[model samples]
Target: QFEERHLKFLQQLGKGNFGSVEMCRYDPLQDNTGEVVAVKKLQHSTEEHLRDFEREIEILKSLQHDNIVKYKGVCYSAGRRNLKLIMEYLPYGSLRDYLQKHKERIDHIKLLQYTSQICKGMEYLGTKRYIHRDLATRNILVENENRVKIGDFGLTKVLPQDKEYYKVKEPGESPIFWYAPESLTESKFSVASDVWSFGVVLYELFTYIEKSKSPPAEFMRMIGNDKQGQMIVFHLIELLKNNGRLPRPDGCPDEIYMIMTECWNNNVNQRPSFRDLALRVDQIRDNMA
Candidate 1:
């Protein structure tokens, strides 16, 4: 029995277009032994919003894996403005926060450990015909014991290769910061888009310092005051050319940078598929032995 006063509010974990995530604790209730679970309270929503929420829940329900966040259950109260989601509590928050808290960059071995788990999760999602379009450091949750779970499937889409259609446009609807060149315009994104995003994530994972500015920000700062009006592409190209040879992290094998750089190339056609990437990374892992 859940008492009205048994709930204790903790802190806000994150906020997105859909709703905010809060940390809540459940006190002992009558007729049951006490159990603790992280409660995510979603805000009042419209039908479209609710539909998207339900879709996410459906996806989670269909997925069963250690790499994926376990969906406990959903709770709704009559005449209430919010819905509650009970989920496994990940104490360490997200990879973004984890990287932010630790100023130093992660070692290559640790990067492999974390990314290997991510690959496992991605492979599982791919096999399920689910494309996790919004995978990012922020979406990767870190449990209390540093275990990883690929969370946040709000942007996920189910793909059917047999009936696939490609959309051609001048340019539209790309996350400019992380999107591939092809995805920015006429070409439709496939698994290659995810690989591009993964390469960006790897770049950040290898070189990020908590207090350091973002790539674009650093570029602007480097060019000084008068260059602020320059086009982003110009800046990006310059930055890449200048920093292309930066040192890799310890334990990062010779082929790691080669593979990531290929994924980040300006020509989207040159990028490898997720399946190929997984196989290549696996080979690198074995080579390290």
Candidate 2:
């Protein structure tokens, strides 16, 4: 039972193809003493969109974890026929943005801590038999005290007990670079696929933190041509397929690189589970500390 009276919309936080999110203040008392929150408003009113919205609400309500974004409830404005989801507000915004802004000041220890938190969140999702098919830095939110929480469950799926992989029947959108080899070739999604994306996020962390003051000549050559960018991406995918690994980012720790390589193992079964990954990340964090 959420209603317009429950929240006062503040500023627009972000907008997407199907919806837009706004910073809001919960004002059930009508007084100024209220909590800040995020309200996601859906733009579509079609039956199909309504069903998807309900599904997302159900999923969010079922999940409860410290590293997972908390859902408040859903509200509908009958006058406008608009549906909205109220969620916990994270002031620091996305992990990608946070990293970009603080990359120069953050050290390896801080990176390890943030990575560990993400692993803990994924581990919780795995234990619940949920596959966050779109795990990436941009989908992760940063809170105060360097806390990170997993968000954006728009592409998540619940797996059947007997099935290791969920085969996709319809074409869906996803970040190509973060996709596992099997996901691209067979349209299969599983926890292992999420692990592959985690490796990509790790690469993002390493690259951003260790970027050189001046771009290397070799690095410049790679993305120099806009017309050939798509081909370059495919070429890298081919390389990963053939070599069973991606090139390590410059200045990445050997241990972290090893974990990333394991996550990208050619055989999906060979990839480490989130539980194992979390333990490794914990050890790394402790060592760095």
Candidate 3:
């Protein structure tokens, strides 16, 4: 149970269509005063919006893991008529931003650490029959010491059977590039689809590192004379769908590339389970040590 009096909004961290996230101080006036937290305030909310917000809260409340973001509590503000979700605030922000900032500086060992944390989180989710439909670098948060935690449950779903695939009701709204070939063609979502998206995240992690090492001219030349980068991206997705493989990112380690290829297999059944993936990631980390 939370009260409006407990929170003191400090500054806006981010704004989205659903609401704004604020960096706030949780001062209940007794103890732990001025403790920092993030408050997500839902704006222009209706009954349906409240339901979705509550759903996310329920999911977070049920989960407890080092690699999973912690949920604090929830409250409603009568004055603003907005629902607020209190959660642990990571000052470093999303993993995508972290990777971009430290691309050149991050080494293979550090990459293994981040990737292993993500796999561990996903493995925990698998044990709970939870499918993080929007598993991407943008949804992963980083804290001090480069600790990673999975966040954002807006598109997450709980499956009755751990391996069962759910038919997507809104394929048009899904991120096509991160989706598996079967998901793109048939609107089917499963753990395998999440693995496919994770593979894409790995590509982003490795390629960004590669790009950081490349000359600006070399990077620009890859975009073609027209420099219609969007078209090039679309063409690449088309190639993946038709040919069942993504072009290996330049300078990607052979071992990492092999794991990525396994994740992006055209056949869903061929993809490794999160448990196996986590074990593989652990092995990779050990090898790097």
Best by TM-score: 2
Model 3: residues with Cα > 4 Å off, grouped in runs: 30-32, 79-81, 161-163, 209-238
- Candidate 1, 55: how far from true, in Å? 0.6
The model with the greatest lDDT is 2
Name the lDDT value of residue 157 in candidate 2: 77
Give the count of colliding residue pairs in each prediction.
0, 0, 0
Candidate 3's error at 253, in angstroms? 1.0
Task: Mark the regions of model 1 whose C-alpha exceeds 4 Å error after superposition.
Answer: 1-8, 27-33, 79-81, 100-106, 144-146, 164-174, 210-213, 218-254, 265-269
How do the predictions measure up, each by TM-score? 0.76, 0.87, 0.84
Q: Estimate, for each residue in 129-214, the C-alpha lDDT of model 1 and write its tens digit.
A: 77676777878888744468897776676776773323334322434456555554444555667777787666666654333544
Q: Mind giving the per-residue lDDT tens digits that candidate 2 earns over 245-274?
A: 545777889999999888889988899988
Give the whole-model CA lDDT for all candidates, comma-separated: 0.65, 0.78, 0.77
- Put down candidate 3 lDDT per residue, 25-78, tens digits, no spaces: 888784765689988877768877778777887998899999999999888767
Instruction: Return whichever of 1 and 3 wins on lDDT.
Output: 3
Q: Per-residue lDDT for 223 in model 1?
A: 56
Q: Return the TM-score for candidate 3, rounded to 2 decimals.
A: 0.84
* Lowest lDDT block of 10, candidate 3: 213-222
What is the lDDT, from 0 to 100, of the residue 133 in candidate 3? 84
CA RMSD per model (angstroms): 4.7, 3.4, 4.2
